[PDB]
Amino acid sequence: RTVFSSLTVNGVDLGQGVAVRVPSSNAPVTDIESDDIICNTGFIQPVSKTVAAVPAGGTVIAHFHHTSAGYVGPDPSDPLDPTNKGPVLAYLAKVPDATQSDVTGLKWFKIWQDGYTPATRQWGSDKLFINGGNATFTIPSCLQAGQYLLRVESISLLNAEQYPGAQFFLSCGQINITGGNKVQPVGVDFPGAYTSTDPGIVTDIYEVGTYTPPGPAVFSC
Ligand SMILES: O[C@@H]1[C@@H](O)[C@H](O[C@@H]2CO[C@@H](O[C@@H]3CO[C@@H](O[C@@H]4CO[C@@H](O)[C@H](O)[C@H]4O)[C@H](O)[C@H]3O)[C@H](O)[C@H]2O)OC[C@H]1O
Numbered sequence: 001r002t003v004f005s006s007l008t009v010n011g012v013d014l015g016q017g018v019a020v021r022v023p024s025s026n027a028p029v030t031d032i033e034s035d036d037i038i039c040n041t042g043f044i045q046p047v048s049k050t051v052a053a054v055p056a057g058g059t060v061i062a063h064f065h066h067t068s069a070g071y072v073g074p075d076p077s078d079p080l081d082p083t084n085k086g087p088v089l090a091y092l093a094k095v096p097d098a099t100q101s102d103v104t105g106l107k108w109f110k111i112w113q114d115g116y117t118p119a120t121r122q123w124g125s126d127k128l129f130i131n132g133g134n135a136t137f138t139i140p141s142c143l144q145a146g147q148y149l150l151r152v153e154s155i156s157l158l159n160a161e162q163y164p165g166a167q168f169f170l171s172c173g174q175i176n177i178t179g180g181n182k183v184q185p186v187g188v189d190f191p192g193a194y195t196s197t198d199p200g201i202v203t204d205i206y207e208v209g210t211y212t213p214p215g216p217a218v219f220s221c
């Protein structure tokens with residue numbers, strides 16, 4: 001169990017809950033056909049009306065912690081219990097307004113992931129743990145400026161030998177990409193991008209040799 005609940009943009013911490021729709025619970029989403037797979041559900045109200053300005057090319061940190069409160073001191077399961085092996089992923093979708101309530105029917109492109117590295121037997125989740133819940137990635141330099149949602153996700157595959165089983169821990173940040181260029185990548189639907197036959201979603205982690213995280217290939221300029 002883990003929750004993405006704060007952002008840092010080019011080394012500046014925005015504050016707990018700022019520009020993120022923070023779920024009230026650290027309970028996972030498990031239904032990949034639910035609209036809950038888009039940006040989670042049950043947000044702490046009132047939801048932030050901050051939209052973080054981020055230059056295209058800028059470095060973002062999405063902060064995960066064990067609970068929706070963020071950092072509350074030492075905890076052996078903060079940011080997650082590292083027995084929960086799996087990937088970490090980040091997607092963007094262009095939106096008319098990053099504070100709009102309706103997140104359905106958006107087109108999501110993947111900008112970062114960290115899956116499994118066979119030679120070191122290390123998962124993205126292990127690195128997230130080592131990094132104190134910091135999922136650090138760059139916003140592609142060539143993107144069209146404007147408002148976007150930033151969907152960042154930690155998947156636990158501990159119970160993923162069947163479907164349902166995989167546990168999806170995700171939130172959406174609210175950003176305004178500045179500068180940039182004119183690229184508007186092709187995206188995928190949520191729900192829809194993840195299916196019950198995807199071997200990134202149904203897998204035995206005690207039988208992993210190679211692993212491919214679910215969803216489309218990472219977009220890069
Ligand atoms: O079908 C029903 C489900 O939808 C429901 O789940 C709840 C759906 O409403 C959620 O609250 C939302 C949170 O998002 C707000 O949107 C904006 C977020 O950005 C802000 O900057 C802006 O001001 C907000 O407008 C939206 O206003 C608010 O309603 C709630 O958290 C979910 O639990 O459950 C019942 C199902 O039957």
Ligand SMILES: *[C@@H]1O[C@H](CO)[C@@H](O[C@@H]2O[C@H](CO)[C@@H](O)[C@H](O)[C@H]2NC(C)=O)[C@H](O)[C@H]1NC(C)=O
Nearest residue numbers: 007008011012013061063129130131132133134
């Ligand atoms: C995770 O991210 C935070 C940024 O939110 C890092 O904290 C900052 O570290 C820099 C340089 O190391 C300092 O200038 C800031 O004063 C720190 N801010 C804090 C502690 O709130 C933090 O080091 C990262 N954690 C890990 C384990 O990498």
Ligand SMILES: *[C@H]1O[C@H](CO)[C@@H](O)[C@H](O)[C@@H]1O
Nearest residue numbers: 010057058059060137138
């Ligand atoms: C944002 O910051 C990181 C270093 O903190 C860089 O690695 C990245 O290229 C971007 O400048």
